[PDB]
Write a protein that binds this ligand. Sequence first.
Ligand SMILES: CC(=O)SCCNC(=O)CCNC(=O)[C@H](O)C(C)(C)COP(=O)(O)OP(=O)(O)OC[C@H]1O[C@@H](n2cnc3c(N)ncnc32)[C@H](O)[C@@H]1OP(=O)(O)O
Ligand SMILES: CC(=O)SCCNC(=O)CCNC(=O)[C@H](O)C(C)(C)COP(=O)(O)OP(=O)(O)OC[C@H]1O[C@@H](n2cnc3c(N)ncnc32)[C@H](O)[C@@H]1OP(=O)(O)O
Ligand SMILES: Nc1ncnc2c1ncn2[C@@H]1O[C@H](COP(=O)(O)OP(=O)(O)OP(=O)(O)O)[C@@H](O)[C@H]1O
Lengths: 168, 168, 474, 168
Amino acid sequence: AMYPDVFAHFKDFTATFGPLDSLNTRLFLQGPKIAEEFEVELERGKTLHIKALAVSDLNRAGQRQVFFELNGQLRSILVKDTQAMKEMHFHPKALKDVKGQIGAPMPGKVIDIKVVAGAKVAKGQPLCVLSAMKMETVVTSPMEGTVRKVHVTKDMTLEGDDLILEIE
Amino acid sequence: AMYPDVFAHFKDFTATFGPLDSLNTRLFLQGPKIAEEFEVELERGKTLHIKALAVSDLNRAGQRQVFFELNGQLRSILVKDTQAMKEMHFHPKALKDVKGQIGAPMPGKVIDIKVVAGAKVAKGQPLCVLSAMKMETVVTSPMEGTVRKVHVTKDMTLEGDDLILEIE
Amino acid sequence: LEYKPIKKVMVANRGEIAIRVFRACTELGIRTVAIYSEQDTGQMHRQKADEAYLIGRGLAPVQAYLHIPDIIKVAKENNVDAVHPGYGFLSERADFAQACQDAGVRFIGPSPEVVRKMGDKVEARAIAIAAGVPVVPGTDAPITSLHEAHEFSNTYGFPIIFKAAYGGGGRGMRVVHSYEELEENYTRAYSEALAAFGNGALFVEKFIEKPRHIEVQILGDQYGNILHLYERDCSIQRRHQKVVEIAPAAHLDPQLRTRLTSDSVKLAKQVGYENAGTVEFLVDRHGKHYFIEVNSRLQVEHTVTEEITDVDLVHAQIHVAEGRSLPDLGLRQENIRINGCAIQCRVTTEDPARSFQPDTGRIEVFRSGEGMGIRLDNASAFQGAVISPHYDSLLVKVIAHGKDHPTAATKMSRALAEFRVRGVKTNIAFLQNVLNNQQFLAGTVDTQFIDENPELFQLRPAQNRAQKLLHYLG
Amino acid sequence: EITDVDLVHAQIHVAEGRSLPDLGLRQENIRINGCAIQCRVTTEDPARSFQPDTGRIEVFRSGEGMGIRLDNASAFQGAVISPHYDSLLVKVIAHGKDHPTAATKMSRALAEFRVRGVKTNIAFLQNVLNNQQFLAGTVDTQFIDENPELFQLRPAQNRAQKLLHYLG
Ligand SMILES: CC(=O)SCCNC(=O)CCNC(=O)[C@H](O)C(C)(C)COP(=O)(O)OP(=O)(O)OC[C@H]1O[C@@H](n2cnc3c(N)ncnc32)[C@H](O)[C@@H]1OP(=O)(O)O
Ligand SMILES: CC(=O)SCCNC(=O)CCNC(=O)[C@H](O)C(C)(C)COP(=O)(O)OP(=O)(O)OC[C@H]1O[C@@H](n2cnc3c(N)ncnc32)[C@H](O)[C@@H]1OP(=O)(O)O
Ligand SMILES: Nc1ncnc2c1ncn2[C@@H]1O[C@H](COP(=O)(O)OP(=O)(O)OP(=O)(O)O)[C@@H](O)[C@H]1O
C-alpha cells in the first residue's frame, strides 16, 4: 500500500537471486576474490563455506562458466555476460503478451511447414511439426491472418517459445 | 645396447606422461585449444573425446590447476608450473640415495626431537618422536655420526622425506 | 543338452538396460561390445563396455538404432556371438530377429515365429479363445461402419471404448457414454485414426468401471519347461502410462492368484514360448479377470520382481541362450519364495504441474540417496549432464525394498528426500505427494485413482537459496 | 541384511522405552536369508607396509547393481583425505543367495569402481577374492601369514590419467 511498484520489484529480486542481507558487505558490493575462501551464515544451523575456482571464456553467445567450490564439492553455473557484445544476430523470442503471436509450447526443431508463404490458414489446421520426446504437436491459428515471410524459416535449430509466425 | 642413455631417458618419459603417438599433430607439439573439441584414438577397441574448459591461476608454490572434461564427465588436474623457479621456498629435500640427508618416510608433524646438533649420540637409539593417524612411530638411529647444522627445529609441517638433520 | 559357449555379446539399445546387461555379462566373464549414435556420444553406456562403435552416421537420431543392416555389419565383423535387444527399440520387430538368425548371430529371446504370432491383436484374440483364459467381450474384426458401432452398442452395453490397432500410441483411446456422445466420438476417433496413422482398424470393447490389471512374469527354456516368477501390481495409472509399481498383490485372494498362475502357465505352454515372457491381465471388482495382451520382451518393471524372489533374470536369459535347462540352474517352483515388499518409482524430467510436459536442460548438481534397502540404477545422471530433447526422459530408476508396504513407502520417501537434482525440472514432488496419500498406504487402489484426486497436485515450492545465492555471486 | 532387521531403528525404539514384542521382534520370528560379504576400502599402500597414503582424489565413480549396497562416507569428486583421522573411503556390501555368487558380485563391483589420484588397495582385495581356498569356504587366522603372494601379485596399468597430464 505504501509502495506498490517497489514492493513487486523487491519481491522479484529475492525470488530470483535468493535471500540477500546475509552476505558480507564487501561480498555484497565487490564480490568474492579468486582463490580466497570465505563463509556465509544462513540460519542457526545452516553454515556455508564458498571458494571460487576459475572463470572460463565466452563460449558462443556471451555466456561464461564459473566453477564454485561450495563446501567439499564443485558447482558449475552459467551467467549471461552484458559488457560483452550485445548486438542480437540470433532468432528473436516470441512475445507472450500478444496471444495472437505464435510460440512453441515445447522445445524442438521444425521439420516441415504445412503452409508456404502466401496461403490462407484456418482454425484447427496443422501448421508445423515440433519435436518432443516421442510426441508431435501441430499449432492451431487463433486468428486468420496473412503470411508474408516465415520468421522460423525452415530446418533450423530453434528452442521453445520462439516466433514462427506473426500477423500484422 | 646401442644407445643406453637415451633409451633410459625415453623409457621414463613414456611412463610419467603415458603412451604417445596416438595424438593429433596439434596436440603433440602445440597442445589443445580452449573451447574446441578434439579426438584421441587410443586403441582399436575404444575411443574418447576431450574438451578443455579453463585454466586457473597460480595458487601455492607454482601448482596451477586445469579443468578438462573426459567423455561424459568433468575432470580436474594439478600441474606443476616449472616456469617460475625464482622463489626460494626452503623446505630442504632429503634424498634417500644420500646417507647424510635424513628424511621422514611418512609426512606429518614432528612431535619431539631428542638430539641436539653437534653433540654425542648413540648408535641405534631413539632420536625423534613421530605422530601417525592413530599410532606412535619411533625412529631408530641407522648409523653413528655427527650432525653439522639443523635448519628446521620444531613445530612446523613437513612432507615425506624432508631434510631436518644431516648425518656425517 | 546342446551347449554353445558365448564369447562376447553386443547390445542394441541405450540407457539403463544396456548398463544392466553389461554388468550381468561382466559378472560372467564375457566380453562386451557396445554401439552408439553420433548425437548420443556423451552417454555413460558406451563407457562401461569394452568395445564401442559408431552407427547411423547420417541417419536421424531416433532411427539410428533402427538400421538392421548396419547393426548386422558391425556384429559380423567383430566376431560377435549373441545380441541382446533389450526393450523399446527392436524387441517387437520380427525382421530383425530373422536377419540375426540369417547371419549366424544368436538372438536372445523367443523365436521370430512366436514374436509374429504375438504381433497384432486379432491373432492374440483368437489364441486366447481357442486355448486360454476368458477375454473382455468385444469385436474381433476391426470396425469401420456406423451400423457396426450402433449394433454392438445396442447388444452388450452402453459404455464402450474405442481402441486403435496397428499402433502403439494412446491417441486412439476414447470413451463413450451415450448415443449423442457415441456418434461424435466415433467420428473424431475414426478421423484421427485414419489421419495420424495408416489403416484405421478401430476396436469396440466394453469399459470396466474400476479396472485393476495384474502382470505375471513368465520364464521358459528350450526344453518345454516354463517357470512363472509371480504377479505384480501397477494400478497407479496416470492415464495409460505406468508411473509406480508394487510387486506383491495388495489385496488379492490366494485362489485368484493361483488361477492367474495356472492360466498364464497354460497360455505359455500352448504357444510354446522360449524366453522372458510377460502376461497382462485385468480383474474386476466382483473378482472376474479378463485377458488383455502378452508382451514378448523383458519388461522395465522386472527389477521389482527380481528382488522379492532374489532371482537374476538376465543371468537366466543368457543361460537359456547358451541352451542350459532350468533344472541344471537350480530354478524350480518349490525353490522360489516371497520375501518382503518392494516399490518402484521412475524419476523423469516431466513437469507434473502443467501437463507433464517434458523439460530439457543441463543438470547442475546431482547427489545419490543410497541407504539400507535402496537399490539404484543410474541411467544417465552426473554433474554437467545434458538431457536430450529427442530421446526418452528417464533420469534414475529408484527401487526401495522393505519387510512391509508401509516400511517400504517410508524408506522410499526418505530416499527421495535425500536426492537433490537442482536446475533440471523434475517430478519428485508429485511422487512424494503420491507416497504420502493415505489411500496408497491403505492398499486398495484403482486405475482412476489419480483421475479423482485433483488435490494430489500439492506442487510444493523450494526456497532453493543455495543455487540462488551463487547466481548472484556469479 | 541376512535378517533384514534395521538395527538403528530398534536401538532408537528401545531407547524410547518400547518393548521388543510391541516392535514385533521374537527369536522365533527372524530367519536366515542368503549370504553377505563386506569389504573396507582404504587408502593403504598394499605393497610397502600397508602404510597410509594421503593426497587428493581426482576421479571417483561408483558401482550399484542387484545385490550391492553402498555407504559413501567421505568419497566424492575432488575430495582431500586428511592424515589425522581414520582412512576409510567407502564401505561396500554385497548380498547374494550363495557365498560364491556374492563373492563374484563383489569382485564385479570392485572392478567397476574407479579411484584415481590416491593409491589404494582394490588389487589386494581382488587377489583375496580370486583365491580358490577363500572361495572354498574355510580360512584361518594365519591365512594371510602363510600366503606371501597376495601382496606381491598386483596388476597396474594406470594409462588414461597420464595422458591428461601431458596435455596440461
Ligand atoms: C540424512 C538423511 O538421509 S536425511 C535427508 C533429508 N533431509 C535433508 O537433506 C536435510 C537438509 N536440508 C536440505 O537440504 C534442504 O533444506 C531441504 C531438503 C529441506 C529443502 O530446502 P531447499 O529450499 O531446497 O534449500 P535451502 O534453501 O534450505 O538450501 C539448501 C542448501 O543449504 C546447504 N545446506 C543444507 N543443509 C545444510 C546443513 N545441515 N549445513 C550446512 N549447509 C546446509 C546446502 O548447500 C543445500 O544445498 P542442497 O539443496 O544442494 O543440499
Ligand atoms: C558394465 C560393468 O559393470 S563392467 C565394468 C568393468 N569393466 C570396465 O569398466 C570396462 C572398461 N575398461 C576400463 O575402464 C579400463 O580399460 C580397465 C578397467 C580395463 C583398466 O584399464 P586402465 O589401464 O586402468 O585404463 P586404460 O588405459 O584402458 O584407459 C581407460 C580410460 O579409457 C576410456 N574408456 C574406457 N572404456 C571405454 C570405452 N568403452 N569407450 C570409450 N572410452 C573408454 C575412459 O576415459 C577410461 O578412463 P577410466 O579409467 O576413468 O574409465
Ligand atoms: N476394456 C478396458 N477397460 C478399461 N481399461 C482398459 C480396457 N482396455 C484397455 N484399458 C486400459 O489400457 C491399458 C492396456 O493398454 P493396451 O492393452 O492398449 O496396451 P499398450 O500397448 O501399452 O497401450 P497404448 O497403445 O496406449 O500404449 C489397461 O491397463 C487400461 O488402463
